[PDB]
């Protein structure tokens, strides 16, 4: 990426979005799955278009990462609806989830943390014209580290290793 990128500014809906994303990650964790959750919010009025969490174990899914599940839960939408929205995710996006954000033109991504995992997508989002904010949420870091430590092979599967 570029030496001139900078983290985005905070939005009035960030506490709301991160809290929903974390709640989804915790729900997934209690269900026996990967603790990664998210939600898509309209930056203009704070409305929640959808929310979701990873469904790899719940549904035997190779594509339902938390971010993809969130978008699936928003349902079919005209392209214009994704404009001026923020996708909240508890963990920095992989290359696939990053690609979903780019394809739909969701302009902003707020990331719970990038300590347990980070792909080239975090910077690629900025290269492609998207704003990224990493909030370093301790709740997210704790639950994700717990999963990685207790079920390493399951985590590796989620990121294709």
- Applying CB under 5 A, which residues contact Zn ion? 65, 94, 96-97
Q: Which of 2, 12, 30, 76 binds a second copy (CB under 8 A)?
A: 76
Burial of 42 (0-12, 13-18, 19+ CB in 10 A): middle
- Edge to edge, the sheet with strand 37-42 lists 48-53, 37-42, 85-89, 108-111, 131-134
For residues 86 and 142, what is the distance between their CA atoms, to the nearest angstrom?
A: 23
42 assigned binding-site residue:
no
Q: Which of 18, 25, 41, 68 binds a second copy (CB under 8 A)?
A: 68
For residues 142 and 8, what is the distance between their CA atoms, to the nearest angstrom?
A: 24
158 assigned binding-site residue:
yes
42 binds a second copy (CB under 8 A): no
For residues 87 and 121, what is the distance between their CA atoms, to the nearest angstrom?
A: 14
Closest CB 96 distance from Zn ion, rounded Å:
5
Region binding a second copy by CB under 8 A among candidate stretches 18-26, 64-72, 84-92, 131-139: 64-72
* Residues taking part in catalysis: 67
CB of 19 or CB of 61, closer to a second copy: 61
39 assigned binding-site residue:
no
CB of 45 or CB of 161, closer to a second copy: 161
Per CB under 8 A, contacts with a second copy among 99-118 are: 99-100, 102-105
Structure tokens at 96: 């696939």
CB of 30 or CB of 60, closer to a second copy: 60
Burial of 129 (0-12, 13-18, 19+ CB in 10 A): exposed
CB 96 within 8 A of CB 64: no
Residues that bind a second copy (CB under 8 A): 56, 60-64, 68, 71-72, 74-79, 82, 94-100, 102-105, 119-121, 128, 156-157, 159-161
């Amino acid at each position: 990426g570029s030496s001139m990128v900078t983290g985005g500014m905070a939005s009035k809906w960030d506490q709301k979005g991160m809290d929903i994303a974390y709640e989804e990650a915790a729900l997934g964790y209690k269900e026996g799955g990967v603790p990664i959750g998210g939600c898509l919010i309209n930056n203009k009025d704070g409305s929640v278009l959808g929310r979701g969490h990873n469904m790899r174990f719940q549904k035997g899914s190779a594509t339902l990462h938390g971010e993809i599940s969130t978008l699936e839960n928003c349902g079919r939408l005209e392209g214009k609806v994704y404009k001026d929205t923020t996708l909240y995710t508890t963990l920095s996006p992989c290359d696939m989830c990053t690609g979903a954000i780019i394809m739909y033109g969701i302009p902003r991504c707020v990331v719970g943390e990038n300590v347990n995992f980070k792909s080239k997508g975090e910077k690629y989002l900025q290269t492609r014209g998207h704003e990224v904010v990493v909030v370093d949420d301790e709740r997210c870091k704790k639950i994700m580290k717990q999963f990685i430590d207790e079920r390493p092979q399951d985590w590796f599967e989620d990121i294709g290793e």
